[PDB]
Amino acid sequence: LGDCLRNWEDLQQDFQGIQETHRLYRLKLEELTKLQANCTNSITRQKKRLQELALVLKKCRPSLSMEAAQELENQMKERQGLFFDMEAYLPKKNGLYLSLVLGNVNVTLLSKQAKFAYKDEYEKFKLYLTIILIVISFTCRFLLNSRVTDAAFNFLLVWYYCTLTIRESILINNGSRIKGWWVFHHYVSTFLSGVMLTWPDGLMYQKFRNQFLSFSMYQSFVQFLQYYYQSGCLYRLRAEGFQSWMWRGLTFLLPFLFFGHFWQLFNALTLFNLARDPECKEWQVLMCGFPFLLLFLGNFFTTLRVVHQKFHS
Amino acid sequence: LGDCLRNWEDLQQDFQGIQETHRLYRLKLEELTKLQANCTNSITRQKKRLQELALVLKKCRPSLSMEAAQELENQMKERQGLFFDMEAYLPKKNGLYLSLVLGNVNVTLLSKQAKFAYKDEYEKFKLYLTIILIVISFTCRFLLNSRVTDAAFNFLLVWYYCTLTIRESILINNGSRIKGWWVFHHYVSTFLSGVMLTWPDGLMYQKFRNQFLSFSMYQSFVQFLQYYYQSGCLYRLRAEGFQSWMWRGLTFLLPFLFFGHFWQLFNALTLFNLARDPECKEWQVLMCGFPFLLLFLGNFFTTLRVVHQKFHS
């Protein structure tokens, strides 16, 4: 007891200060929420008015002695630009997909330190899980051929893509701007790995395994390159010649990304050629073919856009 | 231009104040993070010391003129109780599953208003998606029998359970205390819906469809009752006789929850009885049987514990 009584009295002294510090923290927690409320309401209100006057300018654009109108348009371009900056700091309401999963919790990371550190943890997840795909997909093609192991690799893909969607819809809400297609692509590929999962073994499977498992290897290996491309881009973006690195970086990368897009079409063509063969008699082939064709029409098109912008700017 | 010039000068006046308000908000944002840092470090430090002295008391418990030791133990029970209160307010590091999915973003909802409003949105998600399960599972059993529609219902289950895991690992981190088993149960049932997905049609399937689809209906209908039980509990918890409602509420509910547990074992027994039949010759049956047996051993056991605590307290 002698020690048991002694520790309490001094521990009580230190506990007292900790109790009072938390009392102040509760105050500045609530006062900051009110500051979050007013500031959020103020910007969204003024953004509405200027958009109306921007609409007014839009209707008054033919009203063109018009040099101010172009400059006020630049001024409107400036004002909308600044409001897009501040709102990145304030909490933003979740989108649609983040209301189904993860619920209505504010996932907005305030400081730029966090907005940076999260982007790298997103990359370090794409790489770390990619090599696990290569190892398993390499085994399924060369070492062991069975429906159970191909189901284990396919279930990993359905999880890898569905997880990457949540880790991207946060980045859109966090303040970054990923192209509209990439979020949609992560769905079609999931639905693609869905139909393949319920394929029944037969003659149709052993004619569409090598062309799918090998393609899963090459696309996975390309992901290694995009890492060394984007990781190099982000660190420099944190800090002219960088634009040369950006152009030269995409230059070495574009052939491989186009090679994959043409392979994607070639796997699509096989299925339609395999389906029209009478011996197939499986519903799953033709509904598996369209995602492959759909992915090619999107990827080859969207990749051309980001390059056209790169040459333009 | 006359209107185009006029709006800017007054809009500039209002924009000025909004610019300065955001300037102060940036200050109290950072000062609160430092307050979050110090307060979080202070409690976790003192929690360690008292745990050591609690360990010291643990080793000095046989040292028993011991009435203070019991009271200091109560004092230790009080101190640990208070620290569990404050830390619920401060941000807490993500667990393990929330590091794989959703990344390292603070999902801690500070005010008690949010900690309450999230719990109801979790229930309102369990109900809203349950009736969609009943409608589809009712169709798959009576209206239409096909491998494609049963795959559509099964994929919905794999998503419904995997989504409920994220919406629960947040509640554990948010401050609630869900039993350890319930988070694990949402995995085994997912793995159960996994093996059934790769079942190949044959003689074994049409002998294990009615006993699974109907069981999926009854378990889904029970979920309607748990809603009217928990929703009634939470609203009263927000505010003696309530304990009578709690005891009477579980009393009417316990028979149905036990009826389901015995059905779970009965479906498990069929598979082992079906597997030992030579005509099956499918790997998926016996690996599908153990989850059904595993779920019964857990559910019937854990449900008995929460009732034993209810009678005890």
From Swiss-Prot, chains A, B:
Membrane topology listed for this record: Multi-pass membrane protein
Residue numbers on the Cytoplasmic membrane side: 1-124, 173-179, 230-251
Key words of the record: Cell membrane, Endoplasmic reticulum, Ion channel, Ion transport, Membrane, Nucleus, Transmembrane, Transmembrane helix, Transport
Signals that turn on the gene: Up-regulated during adipocyte differentiation.
Binding site for CoA: 119, 176-177, 226, 229-230, 261, 310
Expressed in which tissues: Widely expressed, with higher expression in the heart, kidneys, colon and sensory neurons of the dorsal root ganglia. Expressed in nociceptors. Highly expressed in white adipose tissue (at protein level). Highly expressed in brown adipose tissue and expressed at low levels in liver.
Pfam families, per database record: TMEM120A-B
Membrane-spanning ranges: 125-145, 152-172, 180-200, 212-229, 252-272, 284-304
Main location: membrane
Gene Ontology cellular component terms for the protein in this record: endoplasmic reticulum; nuclear inner membrane; plasma membrane
Disruption phenotype: Embryonic lethality. Conditional knockout in nociceptors decreases the mechanosensitivity of nociceptors and reduces behavioral responses to painful mechanical stimuli but not to thermal or touch stimuli. Adipocyte-specific knockout induces a lipodystrophy syndrome with insulin resistance and metabolic defects. Conditional knockout in embryonic fibroblasts increases Zika infection in embryonic fibroblasts infected with Zika virus.
Family, similarity comment: Belongs to the TMEM120 family.
Quaternary structure, from the entry: Homodimer. Forms heterooligomer with TMEM120B. Interacts with PKD2; TMEM120A inhibits PKD2 channel activity through the physical association of PKD2 with TMEM120A.
Name of the protein in its database record: Transmembrane protein 120A
Record organism: Mus musculus
